[PDB]
Amino acid sequence: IWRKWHVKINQGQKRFATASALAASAVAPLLMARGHQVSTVPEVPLVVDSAA
């Protein structure tokens, strides 16, 4: 039971990657290549006027 289950990674590298993923969320060609169905959305950074 004393094998190494969890791992440790630098907080600097965690923040780099989560910022890289956010940038790739604004690219429409990448969205289609991941299997999403966005053929009928007006703008790819979709924003709603706080109706919810």
Binding site: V38, P42, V44
Partner: protein, 141 residues
């Protein structure tokens, strides 16, 4: 900037949802892909300018990409349907792709793809009955 057509090819070079890879060759099931091959030249979803042909009920239907509205996908396709004549449809497609410098290298593939779709809407002839060579003796009884 940090994004370009070349960068997107680097990210999606090895694996993407449209890839169909197996033995003897690889294919791509992409809407904007002519010849259905996996290559930078024919990858419609990465290039800024691309072409696509889809069969309609009577003729071909051609969609193109408008570079001005990349961030608005609901209105980023210029579509038109040709259902008048085979020769007339051929001329319009070639002019649409090689008169104003919009992917002039795709002129040959667009015409050929339209020719195949129209060829597939004709009535089919009946295949001749099969013959027997070694089982003829068995069926003689």
């Amino acid at each position: 900037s940090n994004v370009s057509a070349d960068l997107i090819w680097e990210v999606s070079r090895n694996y993407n949802s449209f890839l169909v890879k197996q033995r003897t060759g690889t294919f791509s099931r992409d809407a904007l892909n002519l010849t259905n091959q996996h290559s930078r030249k024919h990858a419609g979803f990465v290039n800024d300018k691309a072409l696509g042909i889809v069969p309609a009920e009577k003729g071909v239907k051609v969609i193109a990409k408008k570079v001005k509205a990349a961030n608005k996908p609901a209105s980023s396709l210029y579509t038109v349907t040709y259902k008048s004549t085979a020769r007339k449809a051929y001329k319009a497609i070639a002019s649409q792709a090689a008169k104003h410098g919009y992917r002039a290298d795709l002129r040959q593939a667009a015409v050929a793809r339209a020719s195949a779709i129209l060829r597939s809407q004709r009535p089919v002839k009946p295949e001749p009955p099969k013959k027997l060579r070694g089982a003829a003796a068995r069926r003689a009884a």
